[PDB]
Amino acid sequence: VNVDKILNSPEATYTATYNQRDLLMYAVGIGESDLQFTYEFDEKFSAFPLYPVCLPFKGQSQDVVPFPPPDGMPNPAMILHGEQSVEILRPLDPSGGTLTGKTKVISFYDKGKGTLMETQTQFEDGNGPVAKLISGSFIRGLTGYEGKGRKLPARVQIPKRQPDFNDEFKTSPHQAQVYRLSGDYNSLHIDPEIAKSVGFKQPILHGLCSMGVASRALFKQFCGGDVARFKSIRVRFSSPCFPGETIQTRMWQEGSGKVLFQAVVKERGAVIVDGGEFVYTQDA
């Protein structure tokens, strides 16, 4: 494997679109019910800030997207979604919009047990940048090379004290059936036979839905009803969640507009979203 050729491979450029209905479908998919996100005539109707994470899946389609949606690139079943970063430069137009996506592999690191591959996506409207996404995939077993990439941000360490704030959300047993309508139609989240074939007695909930659930808690606690205050969020996905389980978001106020967080399944005491770092605009 040649990492230089992977990292010098030109960015891919594409178009993504969303309408108001897509925004509503997303809000219900992550279990949000506040009229700010579920009612187009609300005085403060907005896209939920995390929405751009769906756009690399949905792209330009208004229909079901077949799943799945570089040069020196070397088994899909060995790939885990390990990390996600989302940076919001400007809120999305809640009346709908069309964006240009530019995507590129920015890191390919040999972690020994496998490869960390970081894929960056930048979305722009007509004016300029609106969102920056970094998806960290772990490719199990792929090793034996000199890894290269960007300077990796510090690994988040959760404070050794009780959370400052807690929130809980009971997900529906059919949450994944609703959430998948926002772009990710991976059969792992709906077909019990596919889930069973990879070691799960029931389909698992999309990790990004869990991320949306935690985002809802962070927005509600800190952003004072203003989506423009939701600046950035990054997480590690640590263990699976099943639709029907209760997701607890534990939140640590660290000052300077920084909140560290975890999402935990109440029923099992399993950490599903770890090393959460949230940045928001401090009290206006």
Question: So which residues are the catalytic ones?
Answer: 184, 189, 204, 207
Determine if 246 is a binding residue for its own copies (CB under 8 A): no
Number of residues in contact with its own copies under rule CB under 8 A: 26
- The distance of Cα 281 from the centroid of its chain, to the nearest Å, equals 20
Pick 96 or 129: Cβ nearer its own copies: 96
Q: Cα–Cα distance between 56 and 212 in angstroms, integer?
A: 16
Round to whole Å and give the CA distance between 188 and 156. Answer: 29
165 binds its own copies (CB under 8 A): no
The residue from 13, 19, 197, 202 that contacts its own copies (CB under 8 A) is 19
- In the list 178, 263, 265, 272, the residue contacting its own copies (rule: CB under 8 A) is 178
Binders of its own copies in range 186-205 (CB under 8 A): 187, 190-191
DSSP state of 66: P
Tell me the C-alpha distance between 242 and 28, whole Å.
Answer: 17
Tokens for 201, please give them.
């007695």
Minimum CB distance to its own copies, residue 123 (Å): 20
Q: Which residues contact 269 (CB under 8 A, 6 or more apart)?
A: none
Which of 9, 14, 35, 244 is close enough to bind its own copies by CB under 8 A? 35
Residue 92 beta carbon to its own copies: minimum distance, rounded to whole angstroms: 15
> Is 40 a binder of its own copies (CB under 8 A)?
yes
Sequence-distant (≥ 6) Cβ neighbours of residue 13 within 8 angstroms: 100, 101, 102, 103
Range in contact with its own copies (rule: CB under 8 A) among 79-87, 101-109, 168-176, 212-220:
168-176
Tell the smallest beta-carbon distance from residue 175 to its own copies (Å). 10
Closer residue to its own copies (CB): 2 or 20: 20
User: Smallest distance, Å, CB 100 to its own copies?
Assistant: 21
| Dist. CA 222–CA 127, nearest whole Å | 28
d(CA 139, CA 150): 18
For residues 72 to 111, the per-residue mask of contacts with its own copies, x marking binding by CB under 8 A and - elsewhere, is ------------------------x---------------
Provide the β-strand partners of residue 277: 234, 260
Please give the Cα distance from 71 to 90 (Å, whole number). Answer: 33
Helices 207-222 and 20-29 pack at an angle, to 10 degrees, of 90
- Contact residues toward its own copies (CB under 8 A) are 19-21, 24-25, 28, 33, 35, 38-41, 62-64, 96, 172-174, 177-178, 181, 185, 187, 190-191
